Design a protein around this nucleic acid. Structure first.
Length: 19
RNA sequence: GGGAUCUGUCACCCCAUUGAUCGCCAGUGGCUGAUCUGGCUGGCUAGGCGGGUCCC
């Protein structure tokens, strides 16, 4: 709501990327 | 306008904190907020956007 932050897990789940 | 390739950015799931560091409160405990992270013949005939090149 008021907060503009986002939740993120300790373990990163992002590796691959569009290319 | 369409197709292919390359590069950059963003999201999700499973497995590596009896790996580490920083900050606040606290000698009971709690918080991922950040970074690091191997397996992509693990999932892009799963997704979006920008630029370059080629072809029609």
């Amino acid at each position: 709501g008021i907060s503009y932050g986002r939740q993120l897990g300790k373990k990163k789940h992002r590796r691959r990327a569009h290319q």
